[model samples]
Target: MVLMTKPGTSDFVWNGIPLSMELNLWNIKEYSGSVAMKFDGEKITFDADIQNLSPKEPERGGVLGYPEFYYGYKPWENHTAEGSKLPVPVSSMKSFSVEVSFDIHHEPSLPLNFAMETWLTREKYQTEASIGDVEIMVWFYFNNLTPGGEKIEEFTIPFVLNGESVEGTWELWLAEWGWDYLAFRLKDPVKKGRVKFDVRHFLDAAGKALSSSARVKDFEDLYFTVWEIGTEFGSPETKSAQFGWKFENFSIDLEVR
Candidate 1:
């Protein structure tokens, strides 16, 4: 089920500390586009269009104040749920899997990505701020862009697969300027259809899954209960505007053992 009250239509509100952004998450030099998201049954799609490339409107550009955008999640703003607002206890979950797909026309020099957001690290542990709590994100689509850090690296994680323990290695990048995100990225990329991954390993990193919250204590009460899909623009050398994409068949299957 999607978050109640509204999607991206009229029943939505975008506020709160999106992130402390040590390097200024909104350091976004400039951009020009409009994006939206919608849900249907087990599928959700995100669409976007770029008309200009300058922060010439609303709050003059930031996370939620784009000139042509709806002042919120840009890519699939509607179909996405505010990750920081999940009111349920997620630590109780042993595992969860999400499926996603996309269709886009314009390839961008800038980066366009979406991920699961949570306030567990910030609100509960008090280590970061706003979106800073958004510790994990599963990217479904991307271009020649990086998010982890300035460079790309490969990681092999030990997670339960098909009810069996195995090693899975994935290439991903990360950035800790403000709210750090480690994305399970794709090299061939998908135009449509869906992919799979296990995020339960995030907490699994510190120690055994739920063996004891002492090591990953604060995060146990983490608030990563929401999914937000959207796009971001800008790089030190690029000022792009004609960016867009479409996505569908989105759902995260949650289970515990």
Candidate 2:
């Protein structure tokens, strides 16, 4: 089942402070028995339920704007219902829920515009599998705040993986910036951001698996960190800004099957 909140007056209280915007929540699906998850055909399944543990606030500053706080799939054993912490093997029949929110902040002084969007996609029988697989793709855009908002800059974006730091082979791209593309391997380091690290996955040109490492760095001079995925038929590439300039057009593709 799927659920969503209406667009209305938005406000959230953090440490006795009130902030406002539109809030949204969505219940993707619940699974039973053994479940399989894949990206570009590689298989990685879990025996427990998955849940998204984010609040329903529409603000773009506090936690949501940070890269470390985004993108996570939590297992049932790592969560508790009504103060009762379950064991490792969580109940499969129980429903797992996910919530997403969007908040807009007006910063006239900063030279960039920030917007956050969340969406879900499902593909059944795309590959040979027993149970249907669902993929959630979230797209985030960071626009230059300068006169033209066309130049990109150096920035730090945080991310979380399975309630921890993101560990995997990830790629970035800039279609507007002369079609530049690049890829990086993350190394499991002490997560200084909002999320921790788990098993990071990478793939080859033929859609096969590859070996890579995920790392954490204090890239103080960079402007933005965008995420994307390549299709099976097209050329796979990734790119980023050189200094602190913004790209004319920016987009991201995430694979969560």
Candidate 3:
């Protein structure tokens, strides 16, 4: 299939056999809005009405009221300091609907696999946070393969999120994981499935100070941060991995031919 994006609109198209497409809105400036995705056999579309969702100021001296990494010193850092700015509001944002069309590839020879993994590291501090300085990493993998030995490609259209910008530096990681077998895979004649990486932020830590309490709060969010995975095909590889969040509630889908 082929994919195309329009110049001035949030619309995109996927062409060829079993064509598909998606629409995206980078509303990082504000919140309080709605987003939608639609696909007709020949095209895909996206529409959104968002407000009050722009990045917000951080709480508790900007570091989420956590501890300092070194001696006694505190400073306020902006939420957009380290990573890419979020496209939607940090809190009070909701995902309305995600509809998929499975008419093109009907026969499911092999199923798709989905799983989640979490990794933690020290926060990389800067007068302002940098997207590349993200220390913690979280991964979600999706695989497409039949139990018998057929191969089917899959795609993760768009990832979603909602929350407030808390203290400390928070980072998100999404991509292929080599140490774990949760990613997509084919059979004897191996083939790679389609994969997409998307992230969302609810709170803006843009301008904030770091502190011991903020550090503790940062650790708390990390402690409870859950990883979730979902797929159309289930297998030993998918089952072997541990889940931080319930697989039933997240937004995930699988398609095959």
Candidate 4:
């Protein structure tokens, strides 16, 4: 009931959903390391051991890699599996929820965060690196890392913790990179445990926030483009570190209108 994928393999399907495993060395020109993935019927684990790496541009800050499992659309290319329902209009999203029990670790505790990143786009197939797209990040566990922008608001989002209802305080940060970037950072980090939340709440917050901004005129024009969960690591200061995480239980349930 379980499958282990070593580095270089690219695809996996669990419970009728197809996902892509990409060791994205987006900012690094030279790299030496390994990222591994394992998945079964109800769980997945990812580990990245980066020994040495170099950024494309030394002065500018960059990431060594984002070793992740992506569902729905691929941000770097126009690719979707036969069963994916992504690239759908935001208005059609009736309900979406993600539940996972996870554990994370990093040696020397360099700056890193486990992020569930997604893209909202006016155009259906816009790449994540391109402009004219909205990037939303939900950070689960972070250490010594600041989000992209200044904190605009603080509020509580309701969720399930250990099968009990709870409210989690979160901060919203907004930044612009030719495209809009919104980051939802949890006040209290979840290091290793069960945490479940309805993503609609986050989307609702994002829509409201973006609508009030000068850039966005119509939220209805945006579509949910991609859903990727991973740890983006190897900052300029710590390019050679070990970061790893495991999901004992992970599942996403969605119903579209």
Candidate 5:
């Protein structure tokens, strides 16, 4: 893997999958941090280090940045993952799997979460003209942090973790403004580990859960456009700090019906 100790975005393709990696300092109030990436023929490693940041407001520490990988529908920056097809209708998806393994070193109490973020929109892939109808998030780790909404329900998901199969308990949270925000948070947070699971189950489950709420309508027509994994920190509830992560492996598999 090639290492670039610069704070910016880069594009890569692995097994024909298009990926966008970035160390975003969207709201870095103090701008006291570093982000970098290292990539070889096999995998890419992302790194983030935050020395400090000012709070957006009292008890509301603004975001320093998010070191993340964007997997699909990345037209916002006019970047393309060649040889990849994504932004398909959720109803047409036959299967989707995410395999990620990593070894990380960080403060045990760091107020950060490893998250998978995706968007469900109504139309085909476009530039920034179309807005997604819903946003889905899966949080694998977090501490002293709160998501964007309130908890709606509790559920379980099946997956392989560190070579063992286990059913993980999770909490479902929801927030609605113009679009719906649905977040699935793992009850027990794991800062570092290897895990793999099919995301088709999550879509099916989320579809049913949406039916019980009046906030979202015509969700069945929504198209899955984005797949992202990153560490979210320096949020209102999450204070800034120093931390680093080493990703050993990461891949996404998708099939359309």
Candidate 6:
């Protein structure tokens, strides 16, 4: 993918799924300081660094919230994969699969969760604009436990994804925000960092009966709009749960069935 910046412009855009990318305060609001980076396709050899990290609450954070590059469609009228293109919004499809590999180190005080997220919606979901959205979130953790207090907080912490037994599914809720969702937890214990899901026949396979599924099918005009690889920090009680991640072999391919 070709990535370019409009001299002195905060408008960061990509033409295709990039093998190497950067995230920081400019693109993500969760960051409270300035950041800079450059990634050359292979694995990032500690060549990039995020500095002076003051962060924000996930809710009030900036657009897209984190430093992430998305494939398919973006929030506004800006879309990477065009409805006028081949990978056009899933009118027909086979499956969606993506895999990534990475290792990260963060400030002991600030722990965080990184996610490979997929967003499907017919209309825009912006402030006061209550449009419907089907959010499929897959999560992965970076460490074993706290150098301080450890374990799940008010919310259940997800175990690192590995082989089948260590992995499972959840008909989860935004119980905190009232948005119900479907989550597929596929983790590679060996740390291959991967996930897979079939959109059309999901209920018959890995995904079971979900009220969300009916709601999902309702968006026949539904299009896969957002796919992001970025860090998500929600534990606002503490401000130092610093986070970071990078990977190679990152790819998400969809199909027409």
- Per-residue C-alpha lDDT of model 2 across residues 54-74, encoded as one tens digit per residue: 323323111211111112111
Q: In terms of TM-score, which candidate is strongest?
A: 4
Worst 10 residues of 4 by lDDT: 1-10
Q: Give all candidate RMSDs, comma-separated.
A: 8.9, 21.2, 19.9, 2.4, 2.9, 7.1
Show model 6 residue runs off by greater than 4 Å: 1-34, 44-65, 76-91, 123-129, 142-171, 175-217
In model 2, the worst 10-residue window by lDDT is: 230-239
Candidate 2 all-Cα RMSD: 21.2
- The lDDT of each candidate is 0.41, 0.20, 0.23, 0.75, 0.73, 0.40
lDDT of 3 by residue, 1-257 (tens): 22223212122222321211212122133334454444343433333333333222322111100100111111122112122111122132232122222111112332232322222112322232222211221222223432221222232223222222222222222222221111222112212222223322211221011122222234222211112222222232221111111111122222111
Residue 86 of model 5 has an lDDT of 79
Give the number of the best model, judged by lDDT: 4
For candidate 4, the per-residue lDDT at 229 reads: 83
Instruction: Quote the lDDT for 251 in model 3.
Output: 28
Candidate 1 pairs with clashing backbones = 17-130, 18-131, 19-131, 37-79, 148-173, 148-174, 148-175, 149-174
Candidate 2: what lDDT? 0.20
User: Comparing 3 and 6 by TM-score, which wins?
Assistant: 6
Listed per model in order, the count of residue pairs whose N, CA or C atoms clash below 3 Å is 8, 47, 52, 0, 4, 15
Measured by TM-score, how close is model 5 to the native structure? 0.86
Higher-scoring candidate on lDDT, 1 or 4: 4
**What is the C-alpha lDDT profile of model 4 across 19-70, one tens digit per residue?**
7666566666665666667665567777666666677666657455666777
